[model samples]
Target: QPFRVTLVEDEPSHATLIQYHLNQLGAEVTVHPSGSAFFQHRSQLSTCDLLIVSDQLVDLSIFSLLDIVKEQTKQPSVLILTTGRLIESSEHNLSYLQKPFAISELRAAIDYHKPS
Candidate 1:
């Protein structure tokens, strides 16, 4: 089945890159420029299989968004993106995708958390 993914990213080129990669993985991807934009569609967010969030989010903290999504459903696994090393997190169903990542690296992160 094609995975439904919601990507929250600020950079245009980075958004396109991630969207292309996810599409290559046969994922139905939606790109949101800012966290608030994605949050505006809270219902849609709850239904996606994956949430790819950027650490430099414009409106919300990564944890805050995770909290909102978790309140609605626990089905979507999260992939947090950062410019430096992966951030530490104790949250369940979470993964980290560092910046300048290769498609292979992104795939590994997604594949690892992807629901069976």
Candidate 2:
């Protein structure tokens, strides 16, 4: 089966665009508008191999969301996307894909997170 991914973006248009890109990457991506909705589907967490979260989420802090992911020990690779470079100085193991990035860059980010 194709890898499963969780995509969180508050903007519908942006979500749709990225979802389309993810589809092209051969992943089954589930989109969520907020962290609450994502946590609401906790049962499906194990199925997710990666998370593409917006750097500046509207409601929840990324650290809080990362805490939720860490508790499961699932430790999926995370890719932080933002319209602006907000995390340029942050020290995290996550991959960063800035907004206006090309599909090739997105694909490369996925490759960086892919498990052996």
Candidate 3:
């Protein structure tokens, strides 16, 4: 099965662009254009195999959201795309791809979560 990817991005344009790119790569992507919507639907969000989020988020702390999802879900891989410079600030251990990441790098990150 293709990996299920959950994307929480507040910017609609950014979400669409990312979804388009993911779709081109044949990834099954569910996008949450607003943090509020994703928070309200956290139960559904748990189904994702991987979680990718934006760094310039304003509605909530991305790290906090990751913590909530991690604690609620079992063994879901987490990835963040941020220009924040320091992803080590995340509450849990996670692999992050810096912003402006190439599609190949994004694919590699997804592969890292695939069952070997």
Candidate 4:
């Protein structure tokens, strides 16, 4: 089966760019604008292989959302897209991708986290 990705990016343009690039790899991507809908759609989390979240999430702190993912999901890998210094991830499945990153960099990060 193709890889599954869940993306939470508040910026419409950015989300489109991300989805387009990920789709090129034949991955299924679901976009969430903020954590509010994500929290409400917890059932969908079970199907996700990777969760790409932004620090500027509108409804919940990025850490808070990450905590929920860690606590509830079956270890779906996480990619923190940040503008500042990378947040150190405590979970084994977690990683960070700096913001304003090129699509090539994004692809590399996903490849690194992708199950082998």
Across 56-98, the per-residue lDDT of candidate 3 in tens digits comes to 6788788677766766756467787888575454545477888
Off by over 4 Å in 3: 87-93
Clashes of each: 0, 0, 0, 0
Candidate 1 TM-score to native? 0.84
Weakest ten-residue segment in model 1 by summed lDDT: 84-93
Report the number of the highest-lDDT candidate. Answer: 4
What would the per-residue lDDT of candidate 2 be over residues 12-116, giving only the tens digit for each residue? 888898898788778888999887887787567677888899877778887777777767745666788866564432335577788888888888887666555
Look at candidate 1 and tell me the lDDT of residue 105: 96
TM-score of each: 0.84, 0.81, 0.80, 0.90
Cα RMSD, each candidate: 2.1, 2.8, 2.5, 1.5
Model 2 clash tally?
0
TM-score of 2: 0.81
Q: After superposition, how far is residue 12 of candidate 4 from its true place, in Å?
A: 0.6
The best candidate by TM-score is 4
What Cα-based lDDT does every candidate model obtain?
0.80, 0.77, 0.74, 0.82
- Model 1, span 1-107: residue lDDT tens: 66789899888898998898888777888889988787888788667889898988878887688777776854488788987665455666777777878879987
